[PDB]
Enzyme design. Structure first.
Site, mmCIF file in Angstrom:
data_model
loop_
_atom_site.group_PDB
_atom_site.id
_atom_site.type_symbol
_atom_site.label_atom_id
_atom_site.label_comp_id
_atom_site.label_asym_id
_atom_site.label_seq_id
_atom_site.Cartn_x
_atom_site.Cartn_y
_atom_site.Cartn_z
ATOM 1 N N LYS A 34 0.842 -1.198 0.000
ATOM 2 C CA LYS A 34 0.000 0.000 0.000
ATOM 3 C C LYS A 34 0.877 1.247 0.000
ATOM 4 O O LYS A 34 2.030 1.206 0.424
ATOM 5 C CB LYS A 34 -0.898 0.023 1.203
ATOM 6 C CG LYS A 34 -0.144 0.062 2.493
ATOM 7 N N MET A 107 4.150 -10.330 -10.401
ATOM 8 C CA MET A 107 4.213 -10.193 -8.917
ATOM 9 C C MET A 107 5.643 -10.314 -8.369
ATOM 10 O O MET A 107 6.344 -11.289 -8.666
ATOM 11 C CB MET A 107 3.292 -11.179 -8.177
ATOM 12 C CG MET A 107 3.149 -10.994 -6.578
ATOM 13 S SD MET A 107 1.949 -12.159 -5.968
ATOM 14 C CE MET A 107 2.819 -13.701 -6.180
ATOM 15 N N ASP A 154 12.217 9.711 -8.245
ATOM 16 C CA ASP A 154 11.895 9.325 -6.857
ATOM 17 C C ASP A 154 12.566 8.018 -6.452
ATOM 18 O O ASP A 154 11.963 7.140 -5.797
ATOM 19 C CB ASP A 154 10.397 9.324 -6.561
ATOM 20 C CG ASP A 154 10.117 9.555 -5.053
ATOM 21 O OD1 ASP A 154 11.023 9.947 -4.278
ATOM 22 O OD2 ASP A 154 8.932 9.290 -4.699
HETATM 23 C C1 LIG Z 1 4.618 -7.103 -4.344
HETATM 24 N N1 LIG Z 1 4.287 -5.765 -4.821
HETATM 25 C C2 LIG Z 1 4.123 -4.744 -3.789
HETATM 26 C C3 LIG Z 1 4.398 -5.433 -6.142
HETATM 27 N N2 LIG Z 1 4.614 -6.434 -7.015
HETATM 28 C C4 LIG Z 1 4.650 -6.064 -8.310
HETATM 29 C C5 LIG Z 1 4.562 -4.747 -8.738
HETATM 30 C C6 LIG Z 1 4.400 -3.788 -7.753
HETATM 31 C C7 LIG Z 1 4.341 -2.360 -8.108
HETATM 32 C C8 LIG Z 1 4.244 -1.790 -9.396
HETATM 33 N N3 LIG Z 1 4.259 -0.465 -9.372
HETATM 34 N N4 LIG Z 1 4.319 -0.172 -8.059
HETATM 35 N N5 LIG Z 1 4.369 1.141 -7.670
HETATM 36 C C9 LIG Z 1 4.415 1.338 -6.325
HETATM 37 C C10 LIG Z 1 4.507 0.275 -5.387
HETATM 38 C C11 LIG Z 1 4.506 -1.038 -5.833
HETATM 39 C C12 LIG Z 1 4.384 -1.258 -7.226
HETATM 40 N N6 LIG Z 1 4.324 -4.109 -6.454
#
Ligand SMILES: CN(C)c1nccc(-c2cnn3ncccc23)n1
EC number: 2.7.11.23
Length: 343
Positions: A34, A107, A154
């Site tokens: 999040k 993922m 960022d």
């Molecule tokens: C496990 N997770 C959290 C995840 N997995 C794949 C992609 C992403 C993901 C793609 N863009 N952002 N921007 C901001 C934060 C996370 C992500 N996050």
């Protein structure tokens, strides 16, 4: 009180429900991340027969439009790297669902801030720092290709994610604050600890701002703690000066915000405006522990942490932390540096 016909909370977020089916395609499992943008869920894509991460953007126009910029940049990037060899997260597709823009990604695992926490804030090894550095420089070389010319704007540990919990491979995420060299619009950018001197000084900027952030990130990955932890912009500039000295006069003489931090003497030289260590006396040589067993002395008697290894790392970092964005090391040359392995 009802938000979005009962689908949303008072924070503009979609209320996640475990096992919900969307569009005769995705089965939502659980929340896995999040942030300010919204939420990230683990979901099963029944069409492609695989787990995916779905980034569910807040139902609010400013957050929607930030994510539309991100989608365009991801579509440009992924298209010029169909083999996925350049360390940028892969956007599979997007859709609008119940008034939320949703971005479907491969993922990923933990982020690099989570990894620092898992070290009890003592740092990862120099060998793992080197692996992360080599992948990050390769990603910055790809962003610098002329058809992209993308400034991330960022970079920080929480925007770099592991692919798999047991391996060193990474991907960069979160292009919502990004821009292109030919379309620079933002004056106020970069998270404070990772913010470049040219931005602090109100000067023109380019892709070199991301290399500054990378130098800061790599020191923190090995020591466990941020290099320059300012509480506000004046504190941030003073913490940079403790390590690197007063910036060159040719820069300050052209800086719109020079007098926020410095004063010019009759000499023509510049000094700080009136508690900090004197300029340049907080040596990176000692923060890293080059000759004294690494950060905290904790790497003494460990393989992969010799004086010679530390001198190569120090040399690369100081080139990433050049005050002059025209001479700061660029991705092609960082990849040639002897800190990296030949083959
Ligand atoms: C496990 N997770 C959290 C995840 N997995 C794949 C992609 C992403 C993901 C793609 N863009 N952002 N921007 C901001 C934060 C996370 C992500 N996050």
């Amino acid at each position: 009180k009802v938000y979005n016909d009962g689908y949303d909370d008072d924070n503009y977020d979609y209320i996640v429900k475990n096992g919900e089916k969307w569009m005769d395609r995705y089965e939502i499992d659980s929340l896995i991340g999040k942030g300010s943008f919204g939420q990230v869920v683990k979901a099963y894509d029944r069409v492609e027969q695989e787990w995916v991460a779905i980034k569910i953007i807040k139902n609010k126009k400013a957050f929607l439009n930030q994510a539309q910029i991100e989608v365009r940049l991801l579509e440009l990037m992924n298209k010029h790297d169909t083999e996925m060899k350049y360390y940028i997260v892969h956007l599979k597709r997007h859709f609008m669902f119940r008034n939320h823009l949703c971005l479907v990604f491969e993922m990923l695992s933990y982020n690099l801030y989570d990894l620092l926490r898992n070290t009890n804030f003592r740092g990862v090894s120099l060998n793992l720092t080197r692996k992360f550095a080599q992948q990050m420089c390769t990603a910055l070389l790809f962003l610098a290709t002329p058809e992209l010319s993308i400034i991330h704007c960022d970079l920080k540990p929480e925007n770099i994610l592991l692919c798999n919990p047991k391996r060193s491979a990474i991907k960069i995420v979160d292009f919502g604050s990004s821009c292109q060299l030919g379309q620079r619009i933002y004056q106020y950018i970069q998270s404070r600890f990772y913010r470049s001197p040219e931005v602090l000084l109100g000067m023109p900027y380019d892709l070199a701002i991301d290399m500054w952030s990378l130098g800061c990130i790599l020191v923190e990955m090995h020591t466990g703690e941020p290099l320059f932890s300012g509480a506000n912009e004046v504190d941030q500039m003073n913490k940079i000066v403790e390590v690197l000295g007063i910036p060159p006069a040719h820069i300050l003489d052209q800086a719109p915000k020079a007098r926020k931090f410095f004063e010019k003497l009759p000499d023509g030289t510049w000094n700080l405006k009136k508690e900090y260590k004197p300029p340049g006396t907080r040596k990176l040589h000692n923060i890293l522990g080059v000759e004294t067993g690494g950060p905290g002395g904790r790497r003494a008697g460990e393989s992969g942490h010799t004086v010679a290894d530390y001198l190569k790392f120090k040399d690369l970092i100081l080139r990433m932390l050049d005050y002059d964005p025209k001479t700061r090391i660029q991705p092609y040359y960082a990849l040639q540096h002897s800190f990296f392995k030949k083959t």
